[PDB]
């Protein structure tokens with residue numbers, strides 16, 4: 001019934017907005033805190049009633065120094081990149097995976113691709129095209145999930161709310177395990 005979630009991944013990949021949406025059911029359009037803190041989510045996940053504490057983290061450089069304090073006792077990690085940022089995805093196996101395996105060796109990981117609303121967005125496609133990039137594809141996220149040993153790969157959009165609910169239900173399932 002009481003479970004701990006930690007969410008990690010590159011600066012600006014949409015972690016805080018994802019937690020705010022899960023929690024308050026509305027995307028923050030103007031103000032967004034660096035970290036959304038102290039929130040316990042009530043989740044029903046079939047059978048029990050879970051209280052899922054949501055522990056947000058950050059970088060932007062020095063928030064680096066505190067992040068380690070987030071991992072004691074976690075039950076489930078959401079490890080994020082954004083679908084508008086091929087760069088964010090390479091950081092998964094390069095940075096976030098070693099960091100989390102180090103601090104939380106056997107805790108289940110859900111790999112999440114955030115900003116799914118941008119995958120056909122015109123300005124995004126233009127901006128990436130100029131670098132000979134394109135939005136991350138679902139196949140890529142699934143194979144990264146495979147590679148790093150994740151419990152599963154999911155996509156969502158905090159902006160439209162599509163897929164958010166399912167992220168937290170699967171994380172809750174994972175944490176119960």
Ligand SMILES: Nc1nc2c(ncn2[C@@H]2O[C@H](COP(=O)(O)OP(=O)(O)O)[C@@H](O)[C@H]2O)c(=O)[nH]1
Nearest residue numbers: 011012013014015016017032115117157158159
């Ligand atoms: N298009 C779009 N932008 C989003 C989405 N989620 C967050 N953003 C924007 O992405 C930027 C970073 O968000 P934030 O949650 O602070 O990321 P954090 O540094 O990972 O916590 C902000 O400008 C958010 O509005 C999303 O689902 N879709």
Ligand SMILES: [Mg+2]
Nearest residue numbers: 015016034035
């Ligand atoms: Mg943040």
